[PDB]
Each structure stands twice: as C-alpha cells, then as structure tokens.
From Swiss-Prot, chain C:
Location of the region described as Protruding domain in the Swiss-Prot/TrEMBL record: 199-504
Protein name: Capsid protein VP1
One Gene Ontology cellular component: virion component
Annotated stretches, region: P2 sub-domain: 252-390
Region annotation P1 sub-domain 1: where it falls in the sequence: 199-251
Record region (Interaction with host receptor CD300LF): 272-340
Job description of the protein: Capsid protein self assembles to form an icosahedral capsid with a T=3 symmetry, about 38 nm in diameter, and consisting of 180 capsid proteins. A smaller form of capsid with a diameter of 23 nm might be capsid proteins assembled as icosahedron with T=1 symmetry. The capsid encapsulates the genomic RNA and is decorated with VP2 proteins. Mediates virion attachment to the host cell receptor CD300LF.
Length: 514, 516, 504
C-alpha cells in the first residue's frame, strides 16, 4: 500500500518565531537593513576551527551565540543602534579527505539550559544535524530567537540560542599513521527574513562587536616592557622555564593591567620616594626611602606587590639619584646608590609596605637635604630571573604564572640586553618579556571585548608578503607557537603581526621549525 | 449525604478581587516548537509533594501553616514532566481539605502574595491587605482556590527558581475543643492541585534525572543489614530513650540532606575510628616503647589543620583505646609483626595530645628495646577501656571548630538512635557497652553521592514492617540530618530492625506528629 | 508639544494581560506641573558648549505624589509630560538642545556633535512660552518593579551655542532654566500591596537635637562649639568620626560613643628591674571578639592622635593588702617609637613608675583615657615605620569652601601655659548612629542643609553635606568664625557637586 524510502534528505523542522511584531508596540523605532545583506553567507568573526586525531568524543569544537556578532555587516551596523531582534542562518564547511573517518553533530541549544557538561548521548536530544568529515558541500542550519523578552540590548551579551558542535565519532585514518593530519573547518552566516534593529543612535566606534586590531609597528621599533631598552630579538626556547611569573608587562586583552605594570615605558624599573639620609660610622651614607607613585600620588598597600613599575627581578642594582648638599660652593649633584633586590637577609626590604634601603660608601658625611627623589636603573650585578623581596619574608598578592599551554606549544619571547657589571664572563645578560611596550598600551586605551578564548595571528614580511609563522594570542596576554624542537629558534624582527580571527582553546596550530 | 451537619460546609465566599491572567497564549509566538500536555492530566486533583500539614492547640496566631510557590513543583505529573523542558507558563487550581471534628473551633486566612514582596517576617496585620479568603477549620467540602501567573516576562525557566505568585496560609485564630473528655483534637489538612486550561511547557530538552525538583528517596535496606557510623560494627538496635542526653555533640555520622558532610565524617565505613600516620619509634626505660604518630589522611594525602577538629574518621569519644599496628623489626628471626599499642583518648592528660595539630603518642610496655623502623602505618581499633561518650580534647584545651549539637526538638520530641556494641575490657562488670549514632553509613554515602535539593524544612517518614506490611510509626527527618519522633514515656522503647523507611512529603518545623 | 521622530508607545494595553490589577490615580494629579528634582540650571557667558545642563530618568521619583504612591504598589507603567522654562529677555543669544536617549545607551561623555543624532529639539534662550516634551516608556518588559531601579528613557539637555550678552559692573547676567513634569493619560500602577516604610524613594532626614547636647566622636566629651577656621589644615586625615550617608562606617569609627579612645585587651604584667613594671596588651574587640588585621588600621575606637596619655584598668593583687584596685598606666602613641608599638598587628606596651614587685593576675581589662601630654594632631604609629590601610583625607573642596568643625576640649598636663586644648570632628556620634541605623539611598552628590534658630526661626547659614560625611561652608574671611550651638540642622534637597553656596 505504502512505500517508505530508505534515503531521505536531512532537514530541521521549525515553528516560526515572531520578531518585530512582538517588539513594535514598546519600541520607539523599527529600523530595516539593506535588502542585499539577506543574500550572502559571510565568514563569522569566529569562523575557524580544527579537528585532530588527538581529540576525543565529547569535546566541544565550537559554540556560537545568536546576535549581531555573527556577521561583519551586522557588527558594523550595530554601532548606531541600541537593540535588535530576529533569526539567522549558519553555514559550515569542512576540508576533509577520502582517508578520514568521523562524524560530528551540530545541535541547537535553547537559552537557560544549564551550561555544565553535555555528553554524546544527550547532544542528539536537541534539534541537530549529523555531518560526515568527508562531505564536499556546505551544510546549513537555522537560528531562531527563542526568548522571554521583547528585544535584546546591543551593548550587553544576555542569553540567546546557541549553536554547539561536538565530536560524535573519533577521527581515524586508514593510513598506518600517525601523521599530523588536521581537518580545517569554517563558519559563515547571514540574517533571515525577520531581522531588524531598534533605535537610531549616534555611531560610537568604541563599541562591542568591534574587531580587535594591532598597531602597525615592526618589533625593532618597540620598547621592552621589563627593562628600559629597545627590543632586540624575537625567539622561542624550550630549554627555559615554561611558566614564568613576571610581574611587569602583563596586561589583559580587554584592557585590565595585571601586576605592577605601568602605562608609560618611562616608569619601568624606576620608582619615586621621599628620602632620608644618615651616616653610621664608616659604612657610608644610608638612605631610607618611603615610596610613592611616580605621578606624585600616595601609595597605599592593596592588591599589588609594589608601586607600578617596580623591578620584578633579583640582583644588585646601581641607580642614580639627584641630591642637594648643604656644603659651601657645591650645588645639586647626581649620586650613585647601591640597592639589594634579590631574596636575601641583613636588610629590611618591604616595597609592599613602602620602605626601601640603599647605601653608598663614603669616608665623610657629605650631608644632604631630605626631599622627593626619582630613582632610575643604571647597572645590574648578579642578575637572576626570580621575584624580589616584596615583603620581608611573607606572601604578597601576585599575578599567576603564565600557563596552561596545549601539548607541543611554547611561549614566544621578546629579548633585550641589560647593562651588567661582571668580572669574569663577558657574555651579555639577556632578559625576556611576553608583550612589548606599545602593546601594553593600545590596551586599556582601547576597551575591546574578547568574544572568544584566543586570537589567531600571522607574522609576515613587509614588502614581500611571505608568511613566517602563525600563533595564538590568549586573552591573558601571551603568545604561543607550535614548536617541537630542542634548541632555541629565532626569527627576523622586521615583520608585522596581523589579526586573522577568534579561535577556541582547542585550536591546533600548524607546526614550525627549521 | 453525611451525618449531622452542625458544621460550616462550603466556604463559597471568594469573589476574589483579581483579574484573569493570560497564560501560554503570550508565549506561543516566542517558542520554536509546538508542545502540549496530556489531556487526561487536566482531569483530576492529586496530592501536592508538600500536601500535608497539621494544626494543633499549641500553635499561636501568626504562624505560617504552609506557603506554596506557583510552578511545576506543586504537581507530581508536572514535576516529572519538567525534567525534559526549559520553560513553563500558566495558572493552577488548588484544593484545600480541612474538615476537623464538630467539637473544634478556629479560623485561618489564605492570601495571594505577589512576586517581589520581601520574604521574612509576615505579621497577622498585613495578611488581610492581600486578596485573601477566610476559612473555618470545620469546613466539610474542599475549598478551591486559583493561582495566577502574574509576571512581566513571557515564560519562566524550569531550572533555577524565579519570582512568582505565592499562596500563604496563616493561623488567624487559636484552635480549641469543646469536648468534656481529657484531650484536644488535632486537625490534619491536605493540599491537592491540577493545572488550568492554559498551562504549558516550552522547549524539549534531554531528560536529566538530577533535576532541581525530583524527589528525595532512601535506599531499600533493612537497618539490621547496615553498618554503624561511629564504631566498626554492625547495627544491632533501633531505640528511643528519654533518659539519655538530649543534645549530643557527635562529630562522626553527621551529613546534611543536600549532601554536605559536617564534622569529621568520612565517606567510607572503613575509615571510622582509624587513622593513618607516619610513626617514629623510641625506647624509654619507663613506658617501654614509645611511638609518635604524625597524622595524615587515610588515602595518603597531606593533613592541614583547617575547619575540622581532626582528620576524617578520627574517634570522637573518650577512654583508653587499644589498637593494632603493623611493624617491621631488624632482629634476626622475625621480619613483620602485629603489635598492640594503647593510648589515652581523653582523661585531658599530661599539658599530652593535639589531634588538631596531627600529633599522637602511644606506648607499649617492654623491657628490651625492640628494634623498630620508622615508617608509614595505619591504626584500627581493637579495645576500649573506661569508655565515656564525651568529646575528646583536640587543641590541648583550646577551642576548635566543631559541628553543632543535635537539635532543636519540639516539646515531646525525642531522638531516634541506631545502637551497636563495642569490644570492652572490664574487671568486675560483664554488661555490654553500647554506642549510638543518628544515621547509618549507608545513608551518609547515599546523601553524599545523590545531592538532592531540599524544599521546605523536613521530610515525613513512615516505618513499615516487611513481613506483615504494617506501619509502625511516623517520624520527622530534619534537613540537618537527624530524626525525631513523639514519645512521652519514661523507660526506653525499642523497635524491630526488619523495616524499611519511606518518604511521604515535605513538612515544616512546627509539624505535629502522632504519639508512639 | 513638538513633533519628534518617534513612534507611539503602549502602556497598560501591554501590561494588562499578565498583571493582576490595573490601578487608577487621582484625576487632580493629572492637572499640575510639579518641579522635578535636580531639574534646574544656570547658564553664564563663560560656559563652553558641550556642558551637560541636566539628565533625568523616567520613573515615579520625578513626581513627589507618584513617589509617595509607589509605596503601596508592586509595579508601574506609562509615559509622562515634561515642561522646560527659560528666563531670558530679548537682548540675549544662545541655543540649547534637548534629546531623547534610550534606556541602554552607554554612560559617558557626549560631544555637541553626537547630541543631534538623537530625537531632539533645538531651543533659543529668547523663547517666551515653556517647551513641552513627551517622555515615553521604551522597554523590553511588560511593566517595571517599584522597589527596583531599571533602565528607562532619559532626558538630556546640553549647551549648544554660547550665551552672548552685556552685563553691568556689579552683577553678571545668567539665564536660568527649570524643568517640571506630570503623568500622561497612560500611566498606571499594578498591584495593591501593604504599604512599606523603608522604600527607596525616601528622603534623608536628621535628628532634631541641638549640637550643644551631642557627643564628640573623637574625644569622650560634650561638644562645646562649632566653627570654621581657614588657618587650620584643609584636608585632615582623621580615622574616627567618618561615616557614609548611605550608612557605611569608614576607618576605625565605632557605633557606640563609649568606645571612643578606649580599647580592650589581654594584659601580661612583668616587673622590669629598671624603670618599673611593664604591661603588654594584646588587643581585642570591645564587645569581646577576635581581632584580625585587615583593611582597617586598628580595632574600632582606637585613638587617632599623637602624644602621651594615661589609662586606668581594673587590676587584681595576689598579695594580702587588698584584692581589687584601679591603677594609672602610661603609654606612648606619637611617632616617637622607642617601644615598637604595632596596634595594626594587635599589641601595645605600657609602664608605671613603681618599685618592687607588684604581683597581678591576667584576666582581661578595658583601658579608658585620663589625660594627654604633648598632644599633636597627627595619626599615631600603627606600624613601626610601615604603611597601613586607612581612610583618605577629607576633601576635596570647591574654590572658596572650608570645613566646618565641631570642637571639644580635653584634659592636659602642660606646665607652661594653660589656655585650652582643642580637638575637632566632622560629625557628632549621634549623626553617625543615625546614618548607620537608617541606611538611606543617595541620589546625586550632596545635600543642601540649613541652620535655623528654634524660636525666632531665623536663618543662620547654609552648607553642603557631602556623601563622604563632611560639611563645607562658603567662607571668604581670614580669621576663625564661630557659631551659636542652639540651632537645628534641616535638609532641603539634593544638589550637584558643582553647586555655588551663598557666602557667609
Ligand atoms: Ca655574565
Ligand atoms: Ca563498662
Ligand atoms: Ca598647650
């Protein structure tokens, strides 16, 4: 009587969701967009992901949220509106082989479903599409505005429908292996027929859904963020410790300054304090410094280990100060003082409590008048890359170690050389930073929104266009490279970084090496 | 229909000052699916999960008898169905049953409290400022009330709780009886509910068992087949005794109904009254061989003094405890042995012992210095001498964080005890030494591994006999983790250990239990 | 009214299906334009274009009657009508812009170019009639909650084109502007609830007590006078007598007046072979509690001045000539060190000038002040030479504003001159307790106050009470000026920080 076909094309059944019909009576305006934005799939700002045989079933490959942050045109247009309503459509492409086996599921997760941990059995209880990694053509899905409000505010994030993809079946290759074959995936989107904005406002450039960019300066023309010297090298080195705990040069991508890093590069490794001088018997002058901020304000013990720009390493410091004497026939001079920074004893060093001690040998009194001084670094002796004596021997608030790199990932280092006093070894002492200056700035000056876990960057030659490597910039302000060698590897410093897209935490980078 | 109607019958007085409220019709254009509830569910009144309450002549006006929040948690069908959705809307119908004796008198008020009204002290002056209904306790027919969805959103979320209309009942007039003989009656009221015409759910989601509503359940196991939570022995007795101290401060076997462990109670029953440590041995011409133990966690982790008086599973009583220890010796002929040590738990001794700092001392009498190598060991109990059921010293007389004493109880309520017997050394008395606990270890593991969500204040339990299927008594299980029942006798009372406990409903603290 | 590019907004028609009740308001309220709070400004020839003249948010708090009525309801909905009045003659020039800013626009600084991109109106200062505007309820919900502050439409007025005028030689010309409002025909309340007294639309008030019957917050003595003296330091850093208007205690101030300049501690007495007996105190809370160092310099009520004082404690002797006694100790607070006083860590030292052993027992004591020697108005030594967390100095003040001080006199030991002592405070202890127990809601930056005589009802002066808990007066003199201690302080209204007081 009836025939049931064995092969049916996949589709997602939906019930239509009302947009501006529900929002019109309570909104001030209903603003329509260009009719040709409805005709083209354009790559999402988060539009890159990867699949590897290192992955396991149940891992989330990506998750996207409905809103004007999925389309470059809509993200550009959102700067002159206060709200939005409507549905969208998403397209997915995978670059697979004929030798690869594997299945993924793309599901539609409603708002207010708890965001804990889904499993492979649960993911198929949502409206979904099952996709093979060998597909040649793109796959598309809808995104409806299931909501309890009349419309959404642009300037916040709120809660909306999500699009989550997880690895349903493990990725296998018939080849003996193991290789390092990676399947690339890209995402595109476009609004559906029932999308518009709410209220026409002036265009504000410093809005959310504004893409992050970087200053166009080569690394040679930059300033080191931990020692006052120009940047001289760019390298990766797996023989060095992997998770340092530097306190300077640390900034969040969204603009938060972590640790004791300042805004300007003239505050690095310097300090400002009120000085009092004394003489003991023959040891010379002893200077006690009560520390303040470099702009003249007062220092209060808080969530930082020291005033902004305080040195975060160990050794003996030779510094310069400006002094005035009460002697006859001699006005202001510049004096050199000796300082102890490393974890030691026989002194009471507590910059966390605003007390510092310095000294200089002298057979006379050479009395000086107390006042405000600014101390800058001149020379270093016995340098060690470890935190200083912030308190006497106690614990103070600190920025966390860098971490938590994926397997095979190493840290990119910007390298400069210090002025060092040595007797036997003539080698130049070297110090490293994660991000240079003018990168600490351009953050906290632009208040960006992260919208994802990492940023993909490409390093390129200026006048040739050759690609040197690609890297991941995490939201915590450090760069990772995929390198598996044993020795140091350096790179030319006349390149330019450029932003590609937002990528998730599990993204797999193309390997680098010699 | 009934015999002498010298009562109130129907409380058809409402004309409640409220407008009709729209339900699922406002949420249909904002949902991406079509959902509906089984039409037969809309056709009968079933008892709410919090559908039992009591009025006693010991309550005062202004006490809250029940308060119910609108949502899927008032109906067993709807609470089962809410595990596979994210969203609900609509109104409800509620039936209140309270038909006390004809010799009684009293009055209650049931009010409709809107969302966003602050919770806390609700006095008898304000409850009449709401849309309300006045009820006699002698009313024969059930009283029917509506619960409307007053809201400013289109629907609510099943997981996590939001602000909705409440239904609050407060005792307005004290309950008194007119009978000549010796007693005053108690009124037992019931609540039933069903959805209204426009109730619905929103979006189908995977069915997850560990949802917020669910229902608390207990393991199906007889008390005689369980293990004691304070001494490594089987449970032998189920008892109530009003001559023993009423508010003990035991540190082991304490667990919250939501799953939190309080005190020094371990997950496993093999950690009870045992400890793992690093042992260093020395010879003293007095006590003989002296062993110093620095205590660590039983799984091997480091011990850090924190918000607990001792490492998990440490003994919480007093006396002289004798234990067995595995030891290695360098004397030719013997390699491994089990040695018996003894140590004073309490009498507070000279100065000493500081379990809160991980220091323990023990000794064994001997003449020649036995060659013993320092190492890692685990000690388990063997015997007790001069047992006293009082907390020991942990900080050498200084205060330590402790679990609160068990309580409080309503007047006439006593604590139920699970009893076992310990191996004892005695010189002139041959009577067995007994030790009690509040819950067995199986219940502790069940609560720790299940992590339910509590609703009001306590659970009503009924104890049934497996052989004859006859209910023995009813008790209140408090959310803090103890059990109370009403008993007014003088001597101890014991119960058979062949029964099974069962959950009935959620009850508040002022629930009045029947005597036993 | 004027035409603006905006659509009509529905009120109760959208809230009625899901509301319980829709409640009506007195029809006489719809017939009166009442002054809005923070709805006045003045324009001077020296102002530059781009200054924000006002910005007010839609809600019940714009009208005193609706603010009163909101206490017996759960929600509200609807639009309002607004009137703007400007006072200038025919010989002026300049222009102003009033815009409609939507509920979720980011807060910040607007430029004169961006204000014209909203729905707006342009007005000349020569306008005769008041300018009428609508205030519409643009929202993503069905109604609002009375006890919660949500986002609503705002009305923002900026100076667009500067004022050009002539002025006489004695006074400078200004253009004054005021804003009034009333509900529109589509405004309603939601649900009849029992009235609440601790609502958010509650105005700040002060206790009706004369300052001569009050208590000093820094020294346990009655207040003997109030004054203003520009010669004294402008920005003191007192750690006592500091309270926020919303009710947050700052520094080390206690709630009770009996905790001022007193401390409780566990005492250990040991006889030194030199000067005499020495007592070491481990500080605790006055009511009895563990003291933990934190964001606070010293336990509540600890003295915040420098000098040498004497204390009296209850001591018990194990000898047989007595059992209980009260003796006077001696401790040093000023920045002279020599004993390593660390109140921040919770330990201090004291000594007595006595010979031989003076056996006592350690059973906890409370120390009260007796007299001060070498008093100095500087913070004591909390750490040996280190820094501690403490409250910022009092300020800032506008150009021409001075601090008003409540003065009291303390005992002394000085042997050279016997004129008087002097210790000042910002607010008395009664005001501190009032603000702590009331917990009001602050609106903008400051409150306008008035000092009047109780009987004749004459005005003495007017001042400004800042949110941080200090009073400022507009005084242009040189020497100190004292005031009678018989008046009563009264609250007038909320004022902005840049408010010009009348000179005293
Ligand atoms: Ca060297
Ligand atoms: Ca015995
Ligand atoms: Ca004097």
């Amino acid at each position: 009587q009836d025939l049931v076909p064995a092969a049916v094309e996949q589709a997602v059944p939906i019930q239509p969701v009302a947009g501006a019909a529900l929002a019109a009576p309570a909104a001030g305006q209903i603003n329509q967009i260009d009719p040709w934005i409805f005709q083209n799939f354009v790559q999402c700002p988060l539009g890159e992901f990867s699949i590897s045989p290192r992955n396991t079933p149940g891992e989330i490959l990506f998750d996207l949220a409905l809103g004007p942050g999925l389309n470059p045109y809509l993200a550009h247009l959102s700067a002159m509106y206060t709200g939005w309503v409507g549905n969208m459509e998403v397209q997915l492409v995978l670059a697979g082989n004929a030798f690869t086996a594997g299945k993924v599921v793309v599901a539609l997760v409603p708002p207010y479903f708890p965001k804990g941990s889904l499993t492979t059995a649960q993911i198929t209880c949502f409206p979904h599409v099952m996709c093979d990694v060998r597909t040649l053509e793109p796959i598309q899905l809808p995104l409806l505005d299931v909501r309890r409000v009349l419309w959404h505010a642009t300037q916040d994030q709120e809660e909306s429908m999500r699009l989550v993809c997880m690895l349903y079946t493990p990725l296998r290759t018939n080849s003996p292996g193991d290789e390092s074959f990676v399947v690339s995936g890209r995402l595109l989107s476009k609004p559906a027929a029932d999308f518009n904005f709410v209220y026409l406002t002036p265009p504000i450039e410093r809005t959310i859904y504004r893409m992050v960019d970087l200053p166009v300066i080569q690394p040679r023309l930059c300033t080191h963020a931990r020692w006052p010297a120009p940047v001289y090298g760019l390298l990766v080195d797996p023989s060095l410790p992997s998770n340092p705990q530097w306190q300077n040069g640390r900034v969040h991508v969204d603009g938060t300054l972590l640790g004791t890093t300042p805004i300007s590069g003239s505050w690095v490794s310097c300090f400002a304090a009120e000085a009092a001088y004394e003489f003991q018997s023959g040891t010379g002058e002893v200077a006690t410094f009560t520390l303040i901020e470099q702009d003249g304000s007062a220092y209060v013990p808080g969530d930082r280990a020291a005033p902004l720009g305080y040195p975060d390493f160990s050794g003996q410091l030779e510094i310069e100060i400006q002094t005035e004497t009460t002697k006859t026939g001699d006005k202001l001079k510049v004096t050199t003082f000796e300082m102890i920074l490393g974890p030691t004893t026989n002194a009471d060093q507590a910059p966390y409590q605003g007390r510092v001690f310095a000294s200089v040998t002298a057979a006379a009194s050479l009395d000086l008048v107390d006042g405000r001084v600014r101390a800058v670094p001149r020379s270093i002796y016995g340098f060690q890359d470890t935190i200083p004596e912030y308190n006497d021997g106690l614990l103070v608030p600190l920025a966390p170690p860098i971490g938590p790199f994926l397997p095979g990932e190493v840290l990119l280092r910007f390298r400069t050389y210090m002025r060092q006093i040595d007797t036997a070894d003539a080698a130049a002492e070297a110090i490293d930073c994660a991000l240079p200056q003018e990168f600490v700035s351009w953050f906290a000056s632009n208040a960006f929104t992260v919208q994802s876990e990492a940023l993909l960057l490409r390093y390129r030659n200026t006048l040739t266009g050759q690609l040197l490597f690609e890297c991941k910039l995490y939201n915590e302000g450090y760069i990772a490279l995929s390198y598996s060698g044993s020795g140091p590897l350096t790179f030319p410093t006349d390149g330019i970084f450029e932003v590609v897209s937002w990528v998730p935490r599990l993204y797999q980078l193309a390997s680098v090496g010699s």
